[PDB]
């Protein structure tokens, strides 16, 4: 089922800035008109987030360079899709991802999210093969070009698919004390440039008691067979720009502001800069003229 779509020279930086994102509800308790300070894993404000494209259409006639490397987990990942043709269909997690330990698999098909924290190997380029079914864009079915085994399979889960203008999606992955929680948020953005000049909350969706070890992860991409070449050398596919982001979470304290409706309107980091830190120690989003003392929060 697997192929070898790997022949290129990687561009190491491939990153941009994330202005104000990654804030998610840390608990299941409703609050309103109150500012709460929550010490938890979070993405930094104005952080550096990877900007992998994975589809570099450039040149006189263009090309379909493929790039979905494996990324370290580092005790938390923030992910976004901002797709237009619904071509990102889940993720892969594990320690070494080759018949050693349990590995988590996520696939988002039409009406079934497939979860498999089970022991099986992943090739160097796991992906998904999808076709439009006569261009009707209704059946839109996929393929298992992701793995080749299901040995010693432990956990499974199925429910309504996570996937339902640019359609900016945001996900937060956190493997803490044996509980894997996937938070999510759907937001449309008109601008086709990088992340918007705005803020939005990020709700939880489902918690998984996988209880495994995760150190590296990879993204799954749905690809369409543009042409079938005779003597198949893993012919190039087409999905379109495969534009996804990656963020890294760290343990810090944020101040979360709730409105009357209970939705988060804005948040301020306690380590971004002294001004934002001064807001935390005062537990207020407005700081009057004067001089204030602040407590250390660095690692």
């Amino acid at each position, epitope marked *: *089922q697997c192929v070898n779509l790997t022949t290129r020279t990687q561009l190491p930086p491939a990153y941009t800035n994330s202005f104000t994102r990654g804030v998610y509800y840390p608990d299941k308790v409703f609050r309103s008109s109150v500012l709460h300070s929550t010490q938890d894993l979070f993405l930094p404000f104005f952080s550096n987030v990877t900007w992998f494209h994975a589809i570099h259409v450039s040149g006189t006639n263009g090309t379909k360079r493929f790039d979905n490397p494996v990324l370290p987990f580092n005790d938390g990942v923030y992910f976004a899709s901002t797709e237009k043709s619904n071509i990102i269909r889940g993720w892969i997690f594990g320690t070494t991802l080759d018949s050693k330990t349990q590995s988590l698999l996520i696939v988002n098909n039409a009406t079934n999210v497939v979860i498999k924290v089970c022991e099986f190997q992943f090739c160097n380029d796991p992906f998904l093969g999808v*076709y439009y*079914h*006569k*261009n009707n864009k209704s*059946w839109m*079915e996929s*393929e*298992f*070009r992701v793995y080749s085994s299901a040995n010693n399979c432990t956990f499974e889960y199925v429910s309504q698919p996570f996937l339902m203008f640019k359609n900016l999606r945001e996900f937060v992955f956190k493997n803490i004390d044996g509980y894997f929680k996937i938070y999510s948020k759907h937001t449309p953005i008109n601008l086709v440039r990088d992340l918007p000049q705005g803020f939005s909350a990020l709700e939880p969706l489902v918690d998984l008691p996988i209880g495994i070890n995760i150190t590296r992860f990879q993204t799954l991409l749905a690809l369409h067979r*543009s*042409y*079938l070449t*005779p*003597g*198949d050398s893993s012919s190039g596919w087409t999905a379109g720009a495969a534009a996804y982001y990656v963020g890294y979470l760290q343990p810090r304290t944020f101040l979360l502001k709730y409105n009357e409706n209970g939705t988060i309107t804005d948040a301020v980091d306690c380590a971004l800069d002294p001004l934002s830190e001064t807001k935390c120690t005062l537990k207020s989003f407005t700081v009057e003229k004067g001089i204030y003392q602040t407590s250390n929060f660095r690692v």
Partner: antibody
Amino acid sequence: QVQLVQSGAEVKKAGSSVKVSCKASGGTFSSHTITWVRQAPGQGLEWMGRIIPILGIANYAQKFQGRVTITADKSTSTAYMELSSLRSEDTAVYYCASLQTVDTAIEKYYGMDVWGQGTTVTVSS
Amino acid sequence: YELTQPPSVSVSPGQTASITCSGDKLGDKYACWYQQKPGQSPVLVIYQDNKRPSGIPERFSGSNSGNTATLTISGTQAMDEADYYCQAWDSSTAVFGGGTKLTVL
């Protein structure tokens, strides 16, 4: 890429067990459902069934109910079948083709991308 | 589920040929058409709805109507001699029709 090269024409007596197979020699044996269609002179095409190697689920046709025993093993990377109770009228040319998918409801997503050269069978009586 | 088509069709070269593959509830069933030449194995020219796989010249086209499937031929040549079989994957099974033989003067 699958060539689906198979054996040439064979001569055998009537009422004997018939064994025919196609060997790929090209792409991976799995990841490509293998189906067979019978070609006869002035009778159109006849579909009997298909087998998915990796899934191992085989579907039969209405007229070929119980007269075929389809098996496929990944270790041998070859698909072979046992045919019996064959009459002279049933004699025809058998073909084998791939379908690019290995799932039951997904064979609708493709046509028969590659065919075989055709292995004619003659019945002697 | 049952396929019946004319035994044969004849048309002058360079003309537009229309072939009808009638049946029972074949519209909204996503029929597919195949091609077979004398002395050569069958090849895929129309896949999943009048769709032409890569490597095939832009000569075969058509549309699927409410209860009929039609194939239009453009730029007919001498080497177009072949037999067309229209089939569909119905009820987890494939049904093959009698087929039509194209004749060119």
